[PDB]
Design a protein around this ligand. Sequence first.
Ligand code: ALF
Ligand SMILES: [Mg+2]
Length: 361
Amino acid sequence: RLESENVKRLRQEKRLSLIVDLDQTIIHATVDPTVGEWMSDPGNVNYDVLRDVRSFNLQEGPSGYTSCYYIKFRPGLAQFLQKISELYELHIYTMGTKAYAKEVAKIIDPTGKLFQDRVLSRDDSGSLAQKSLRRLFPCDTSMVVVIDDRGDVWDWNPNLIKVVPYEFFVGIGDINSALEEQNKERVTALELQKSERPLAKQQNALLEDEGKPTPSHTLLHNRDHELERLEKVLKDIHAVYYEEENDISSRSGNHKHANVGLIIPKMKQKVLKGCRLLFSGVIPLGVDVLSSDIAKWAMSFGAEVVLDFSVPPTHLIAAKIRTEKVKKAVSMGNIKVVKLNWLTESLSQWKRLPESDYLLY
Ligand code: ALF
Ligand SMILES: [Mg+2]
């Protein structure tokens, strides 16, 4: 009764549901103790961009291994969640532990107003590898949208809006990327990040180089504007859904409704429609091309993927290597040989970029 009732409640509130991933989507976390050092020194070159960083401690594992996690909020997060919460009922669904999720929630939702108890972690999601809409909406996913920096954990679900991974702490990826005892590998990874101090090593390297650009000698920067773009995409999805929902329901007395799983692909398919892609040296010889992540991501944006020249492709995505495919493409004509960057960047910006800026040879 709760589920079906929820759908009715949301449509009455004129809202949709939004599932939010944490790491590299709305925050970036690291346990490199270098952060605490830089934050305690107003004269440090990284001090200013770390002013809004927040931290907390967690004891993980049977041995009670403790770590101080430093969390950076993606630029404009507060306003983003504020505005989007008026259009979407927020959910947190992370691969981090329940304790991790709760600590992050206390910091981005102190009052508990945005998300509430609508937090999902690897402790209760039901899977340590993939995420599923069915864990939250078993029978009806027509109103749930997802924002995550990874498409593979969602099996490139049509309801997903892949976001550009947020990397504030340069060089640090996702700290939450057999079983329990084998997870001694988590302690091992956290320990290694603490001892290597990747941030300090990189900062030292930038300072040791006798280049020229002064600000480029500073490791950390605030240059991200991904949430502004995302806000526009989510507001658009919301409008289209309720616009069609009104027409769809009125014409069928509520028997039929709108479906974000149909709306989102529609929008995406316009970006690379007309493109037929041939990859060269981008996918391992041991990986099925058409089922690879890059292929599914490109295809979700209207791109067609081919395996040869039998039907000459519009683009040749080359690994910056000089191979027979590159040669063959050039000797031919009308192929645009471009770096992988052209594709990933175009896909990330929901806009087909100028091939002119990504040539190889
Ligand atoms: F917070 Al994650 F995949 F980054 F669940
Ligand atoms: Mg993530």
